[model samples]
Target: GPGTACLTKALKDSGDLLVELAVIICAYQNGKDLQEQDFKELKELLERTLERAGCALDDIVADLGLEELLGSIGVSTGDIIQGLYKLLKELKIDETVFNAVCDVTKKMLDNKCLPKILQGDLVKFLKDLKYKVCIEGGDPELIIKDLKIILERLPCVLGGVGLDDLFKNIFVKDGILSFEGIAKPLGDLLILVLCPNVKNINV
Candidate 1:
């Protein structure tokens, strides 16, 4: 298993790098999102970023290889979920981002999104989010571009409830709708837009 050993080392290194990247990306994303906040908020975000980064690293490590190994150390579906949990708790990331990530990964792991190579690329892309945002240039726009397409498709595939029904379900508050129905609709829209993959499809 000489090849396996070499590959394992390589994977371990890549996994470490990915973990680092995830932390940095979470920080950058959080900072960008909270740019409007005052100094106190900014400081809080920095703290959150540190927490997110640490959590992601630990979570990824915990679930390193219950599945395939593109290289050496490899990642599993569980790793992705764990990484996401860290990001969510630390940054309090909008569930939309979480859902988008999940949806895209679903395609990758399930072979729904074109060729198999693309799935690897997509996984790399997600892991790269931390690197791109923190090291490469903090390009929020580019990150969104990658994330948005996957997110846009998820509602139709995962959310059996159409937009109108979704609107009705969330908007018809207390058995009645209101012009000031911004809260529920907007919330549902955000979830639909960002994290449609996480929704229980049959439910």
Candidate 2:
């Protein structure tokens, strides 16, 4: 039984809370329910807005029984995973937050949350991961290792798309072309792109 004062105080303290709450309330008023994909969209929007406003996700939803509410609507874990994947693609989350997300995704996979990860915005998630690793100096090895694990567990995840496009832009072309105007040592560039098996030649 969380009080309205507690919720209001929390919202007031978080600068973007009004906008976030308004979005959710608007969705509800428009006849959206927790069972709908729109709810997932709202959740992602809330997560990003909270991050931007320096508010924790727990403060917004912990006492709100969101999980129970979603469960009552027969929402699956895959649904939640897909929503989170969408969030990762749409927002450049903080490094610590991103790590937590990766951990959650891994756990979901371990628990057989496959269909959503495969059919969801996983390509975008990979691209997001690549950008974050490159720009934010995230540990490339760990990320690569996790990706390999996922591929091993779900071999057909990449079967739907051309593999070349997936690995593109991770490195310079033939160790000569500057990648998108960013200057890096040829050795390092070669090292990063080579592991992903991106061919230098457009074959």
Candidate 3:
């Protein structure tokens, strides 16, 4: 409908608002997960944001809400994250924007996917991965970056499993974020630890 540059330009402000919505959902926890009140706030914010963006919610909803739908329909931690990333990548969104949005939006992910906070086992896995610079601890500020980097390393360390398959299998529980499945597979890889561990494993 519009030049990619101009349309993407039109979208830029709304894109930021979209991310803001994600943040609100995540941070609404006042000693508890999001409640009906939180959901109401999300709806109210979305209504106003849509008014300014001028998209018929239906036209854009499929593309934008697809990640949430994916979770409802039985997906997992990495699946929805990977799915959301694919959506932006297919739309030619820049990686930095994706990373920036991901940095904020990843915390709330989907209620059905990753929990409001990372699950206990998931945290330990992420905890172990954190640190080592360009590695886990993989940019504490940027959530998806670590997952992708670790995803990149898995094939070489183990055997090659395609991206979607690897992601779907690891870190996913019954449509939720988990680690036992992955810890089992990556157990040996993680345990290897080089005996003398490492840090600052850069690109």
Q: How much is the lDDT of residue 36 in candidate 1?
A: 34
Which 10-residue span in candidate 3 carries the lowest summed lDDT?
194-203
Report the lDDT tens digits of candidate 2 across residue range 1-203: 33333444554474234423332333333331335565565556555655665655554344333355443666443344344334333333233433333443443344343344433433333443344333344454454434444444444434433333433433434433232312233224333642232211111
Clashing pairs in 3: 129-136, 129-137, 130-136, 130-137, 131-136, 131-137
Tell me each candidate's TM-score. Answer: 0.24, 0.26, 0.31
By TM-score, is 1 or 2 better? 2
- Per-residue CA lDDT of model 1 for 1-203, tens digit only, reads 33223323433444432322333333333322223333333233333433443333333334433345567574432344354456335534344544445444444333233222221234444443333322233344454344334434434332343544443333333433321243344344333442343231111
Q: lDDT of candidate 2?
A: 0.39
Per-residue error for 28 in candidate 3, Å, reads 8.9
- Name the 10 consecutive residues with the lowest summed lDDT in model 2: 194-203
In model 2, how large is the Cα lDDT of residue 177?
29
Off by over 4 Å in 2: 1-10, 13-16, 31-37, 65-203
Clashing residue pairs for model 1: 11-73, 25-130, 96-194, 99-195
- Per-prediction backbone clash count: 4, 0, 6
lDDT of each: 0.36, 0.39, 0.39
